């Protein structure tokens, strides 16, 4: 009933990414991250930020011509934490409650048929 673009939220710890793009993917439309709405490093991934940035993104999204979207939420992954970080949670709500539409959202976290030695050595990151 709308005009569909793609959402794609990368939301690891230390920062959260939101940016809508063409349903094909190639041509982007609007972005902004957590590290763009507060200055403190320490607070780069926290919900309160991903909010204020999911706000910014929604604005441009409907200022160019996208009325809706599908999201692909995603973590760091690879040979790392494979778990959803703090701010995708918030940003999802902050972009639906924005007054945009939602339709079909799968996780696209890179999960290998495992390997390439994980970092941090055999004894693990110890402290």
């Amino acid at each position: 009933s709308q005009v569909f673009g793609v959402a794609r939220i990368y939301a690891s710890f230390n920062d959260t990414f939101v940016h809508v793009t063409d349903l094909s993917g190639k041509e982007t439309i609007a972005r902004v991250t957590g590290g763009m709405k507060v200055k403190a490093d320490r607070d780069e991934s926290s919900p309160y930020a991903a909010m204020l940035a999911a706000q910014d993104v929604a604005a441009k999204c409907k200022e160019v011509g996208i009325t809706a979207v599908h999201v692909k939420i995603r973590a760091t992954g690879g040979t790392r934490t494979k778990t959803p970080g703090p701010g995708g949670q918030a940003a999802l709500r902050a972009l639906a409650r924005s007054g945009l539409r939602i339709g079909r959202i799968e996780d696209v976290t890179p999960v290998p048929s495992d390997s390439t030695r994980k970092k941090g050595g055999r004894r693990g990151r110890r402290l």
Partner: protein
């Protein structure tokens, strides 16, 4: 002080034949400028859309489909096919402990000389009265299944193009043909064609491509 928004040319995406709709969405390019244009440069891209969204019914929530643009004629850009996928969440659900996984694949050709690698997955099932709490098969069981899945997969492909193969997968005939030969070996549940990743096509051929639209 630019804003490339007041600068990009707009397009609308039309899918191929054998589904419900073909109108899927919109896209942004750039002005068909002299030297590097809105034509040849891009368009030839790809689009993932849950085929339920282009089949209507929700008995198709999983199953992702790749559409690729090969031709374009005045704002109207027509796609054909690039592959098929599964939703990550679906798969991660039909894989449970206490049971056997079974995967098997084959690289194979079609009439319209497309090469493709197609996948298939299946899991053991408990008998409808089975007391023991796991149910795995017997490795000899597994070898036997795969060889027969493979027997049936090569059969379907080299059916008329991906075109009828496209028509073939959609009502998941294959899934049950498997389960038929199968039943003589070992129970099993789920059983899907899961994935297929294309990977080699012949030569453009404006004819046959145009022969998907009207």
């Amino acid at each position: 002080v630019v804003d490339p928004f007041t600068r990009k040319e707009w397009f609308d995406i039309k899918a191929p034949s054998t589904f419900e709709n073909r109108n899927v969405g919109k896209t942004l390019v750039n002005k068909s400028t002299g030297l590097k244009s809105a034509s040849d440069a891009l368009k030839g891209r790809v689009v993932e859309v849950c085929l339920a969204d282009l089949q209507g019914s929700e008995d198709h929530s999983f199953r992702k489909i790749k559409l690729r643009v090969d031709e374009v004629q005045g704002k109207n850009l027509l796609t054909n096919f690039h592959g098929m996928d599964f939703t990550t969440d679906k798969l991660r659900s039909m894989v449970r402990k206490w049971q056997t996984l079974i995967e098997a694949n084959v690289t194979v050709k079609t009439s319209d000389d497309y090469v493709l690698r197609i996948f298939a997955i299946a899991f053991t099932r408990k008998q409808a009265n089975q007391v023991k709490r796991h149910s795995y098969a017997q490795s000899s069981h597994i070898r036997a299944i795969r060889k027969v899945i493979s027997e049936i997969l090569t059969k379907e492909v080299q059916g008329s193009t991906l075109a009828q193969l496209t028509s073939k997968l959609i009502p998941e005939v294959i899934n049950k043909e498997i389960e038929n030969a199968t039943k003589d070996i070992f129970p099993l549940q789920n059983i899907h064609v899961r994935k297929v990743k294309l990977l080699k096509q012949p030569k453009f051929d404006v004819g046959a491509l145009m022969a998907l639209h009207g």
